[PDB]
């Protein structure tokens, strides 16, 4: 879609449980800098989800929260879940009854997971410095609406279980275009990952991606098998810009690529849907909840994704990205990325450093 200049935006903020609130607080301090500099109004409507909603309403995704989510332009979500609520069944716990239920209600079709290895944290990566090479800067664009997680028929009886892996043209068109557009505004390269040598779903996938790629003549398209992509993420990850793939392969590969920066606290996530959903790629951290330890960068970079993809504020998002990088490049580390742990800054300190830097470079 075309993003026109808008000066009033509405965000549903659902801070969650445990570290959620701590890191969402910092993200919102960065949003305050953006607000000051751009003169735009971000109307924030706060909503209760997960443990917070169970306590207040008796259920993890109450009607009130759903209404807030459906009335906002974008949804900004912290983390949900904690030991207080474990021991509730399945359907009633935060992570299932709250988070998975929200995701389902949004009819999401794409998950976008950017992965950067910062030059200054290469020593934190599991990969040797020469393997990282000229650098890692990629994005997985994963199909979320169909494929094997939703294909019918599916079922389980006493002797067998089955699922159907299926793609159709309209589904693949939608996600392919998403990936091509992201590629257009990045390094103009898409790699599509499938298993077209063995699976019919993947033969259809590849056929339709090749069709869409004609609408984007300036974007380089390569195709690789998922097993070979799994090896290439480790042997030469710098070859990738946008990685376009299926529900299942994207699930496996985006988690593999998450090992590369070597901390989940660094990694943002966006899902595109009826409304877009912005959240850290990693989950609950019950053992540090409340201690001002958690790394806020994932939540902050999720804010940057929201600005870019919900609001078309691409320049602003790139400035947030730059301020994070500059603070890291300066040597500042939360515990999750510190070699010397007693030299770690807190959640709140890290958040203030990023805000002061963003004001500096703006």
CA 322-1-298 angle, to 5 degrees, is 30
CA torsion 229→233→236→238, rounded to 10°?
110
Largest CA distance in the chain: 64
Q: Which two tokens stand for residue 133?
A: 């090479």
Q: Whose structure tokens read 């042997």? A: 235
User: Is residue 247 within the footprint of Cl ion (CB under 5 A)?
Assistant: yes
Between residue 199 and residue 228, which ones bind a copy of itself under the rule CB under 8 A? Answer: 199-205, 226-228
Using the Cα atoms of residue 331, residue 333, residue 336 and residue 341 in order, give the sign of their dihedral.
positive
Q: Closest separation between CB of residue 91 and a copy of itself, Å?
A: 14
Q: How many residues bind a copy of itself (CB under 8 A)?
A: 50
Catalytic pick from 17, 241, 251, 336? 251
Rank residues 201 and 299 by Cβ distance to Cl ion and give the closer one. 201
User: Is residue 260 within the footprint of a copy of itself (CB under 8 A)?
Assistant: yes
User: Is residue 271 within the footprint of a copy of itself (CB under 8 A)?
Assistant: no
CA torsion 64→68→69→71, rounded to 10°?
130
Catalytic pick from 116, 195, 275, 319? 195
- Dist CA 287 CA 61 (whole Å): 24
Q: Which two tokens stand for residue 2?
A: 């075309």
User: Is residue 192 within the footprint of a copy of itself (CB under 8 A)?
Assistant: no
Out of 6, 169, 318, 343, name the contact with a copy of itself by CB under 8 A: 169
User: Is residue 57 within the footprint of a copy of itself (CB under 8 A)?
Assistant: no
Residues marked as binding? 82-95, 103, 113, 142, 227, 251, 255, 283-295
Residues 6+ apart with CB under 8 A from 348: 25, 26, 292
Catalytic pick from 67, 104, 168, 227? 227
Out of 156, 214, 217, 340, name the contact with a copy of itself by CB under 8 A: 156
Active site residues: 149, 195, 227, 251, 255
Q: Which parts of this chain interact with Cl ion (CB under 5 A)?
A: 147-148, 246-248
């Amino acid at each position: 879609k075309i993003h026109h200049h808008h000066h009033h935006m509405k965000i549903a903020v659902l801070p969650g449980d445990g570290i959620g609130p701590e890191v969402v607080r910092e993200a919102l301090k960065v949003l305050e800098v953006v607000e000051k500099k751009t003169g735009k109004t971000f109307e924030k409507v706060f909503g209760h989800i997960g443990g917070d909603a169970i306590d207040r309403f008796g259920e993890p995704l109450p009607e009130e929260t759903k209404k807030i989510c459906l009335e906002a332009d974008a949804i900004f979500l912290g983390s949900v879940g904690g030991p207080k609520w474990d021991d509730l069944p399945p359907e009633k716990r935060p992570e299932i009854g709250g988070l998975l239920a929200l995701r389902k209600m949004l009819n999401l079709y794409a998950n976008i997971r950017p992965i950067k290895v910062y030059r200054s944290l290469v020593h934190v990566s599991p990969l040797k410095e020469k393997v990282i090479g000229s650098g890692v800067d990629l994005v997985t664009v994963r199909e979320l609406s169909y494929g094997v997680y939703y294909g019918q028929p599916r079922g389980l009886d006493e002797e067998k279980g089955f699922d159907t892996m299926i793609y159709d043209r309209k589904t693949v068109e939608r996600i392919a275009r998403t990936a091509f557009e992201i590629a257009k505004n990045r390094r103009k390269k898409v790699t599509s990952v499938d298993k077209a040598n063995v699976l019919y779903s993947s033969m259809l996938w590849r056929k339709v991606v090749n069709e869409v790629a004609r609408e984007y003549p300036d974007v380089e398209l390569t195709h690789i098998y998922v097993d070979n992509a799994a090896m290439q993420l480790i042997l030469k990850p710098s070859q990738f810009d946008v990685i376009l793939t299926t529900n299942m392969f994207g699930d496996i590969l985006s988690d593999e690529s998450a090992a590369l920066p070597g901390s989940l606290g660094l990694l943002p996530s966006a899902s595109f849907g009826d409304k877009n959903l912005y959240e850290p790629a990693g989950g609950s951290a019950p053992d540090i909840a409340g201690k001002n330890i958690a790394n806020p960068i994932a939540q902050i970079l999720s804010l940057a994704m929201m600005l870019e993809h919900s609001f078309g504020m691409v320049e602003e998002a790139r400035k947030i990205e730059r301020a994070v990088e500059l603070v890291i490049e300066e040597g500042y580390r939360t515990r999750d990325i510190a070699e010397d742990p007693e030299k770690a800054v807190s959640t709140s300190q890290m958040g203030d450093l990023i805000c002061k830097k963003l004001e500096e470079i703006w």
